[PDB]
Structures are given as C-alpha cells and as structure tokens.
Amino acid sequence: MNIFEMLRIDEGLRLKIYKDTEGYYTIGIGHLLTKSPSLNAAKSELDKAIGRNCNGVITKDEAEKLFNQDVDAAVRGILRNAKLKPVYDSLDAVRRCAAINMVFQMGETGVAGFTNSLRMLQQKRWDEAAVNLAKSRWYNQTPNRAKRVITTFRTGTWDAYK
C-alpha cells in the first residue's frame, strides 16, 4: 500500500475524457483537464499534456505517466506551502498519504485552508481531527472517499483500503 495504489483506488482509470464528480473534464487516473464547459478546451489541454494529438483518448502508459506527474506535483505543493509543510513533516508515512490524497483531490490552496483540521493533525488529536474533517463540503459531496481518507488519518492504517 502506497500513495499510488491509494489514489488509483479512489480515482479509477479511464482512457477517454470523462467528467469528474464536479462535472469537469478529466482523463486517466483523475487528471483534471479544465473547468471550462468546452470539450475542445479539454482536448487542447490533453494534447498539451501528452505531447501529441490525442482526440480525447490516451494509453494506459500515458495515464500512468500523467498520474506520476500529478502525485509529484501534489507532494511538491505541500513541501512549498508554509501551512502544509510543518503538518506533513509531523505525520507518519501512512498519514502523509492521506494528506497527499486530499491535495490531489482539492489542490494545495483548498487544503491549506483546512486550518483547524491541520492543527488537530499536527497535535496528533486523531479522533478530533477526523470529526473536524467531516464538517466539510468535501465530505458531504464525496463521502465514501472522504471517509476512507479520514479513516486513514484517524488510524494511521490502510484498513479503509483493504
């Protein structure tokens, strides 16, 4: 169990442009293409990301390559963020995966705003952090995925994914 397997479970794999839970054009293992309603705009982003004319379709190798880039970008965004880095550095490796998962789904800026949850996590008040994390649009809109991530923060185990 590692961040790649965890996010692969949470995001699935689709080789043609699809819409995420918010209605936004996406491809692969949860790679957001654009928030624009234009499918042509999404296709342009895809071609730029892959480096060829894709027609809205990629290979599994390409999906996995984008996925590695996206996971790394989430980690780098954490490490460059003055609010997120101290919390991340305080966590064990399993809980660090839960943190990356949140940043992958919502972005550095959104997670950096989870100020009270982050403090509880840094204080290792796991049950209180889990309660606080669920008081969110995130939990209400994607409750099964948020429950898995929250259980990972609460327990420091992979139990929710097993």
Ligand SMILES: Fc1ccc(I)cc1
């Ligand atoms: F550094 C961190 C980034 C995101 C979370 I959620 C927790 C720690």
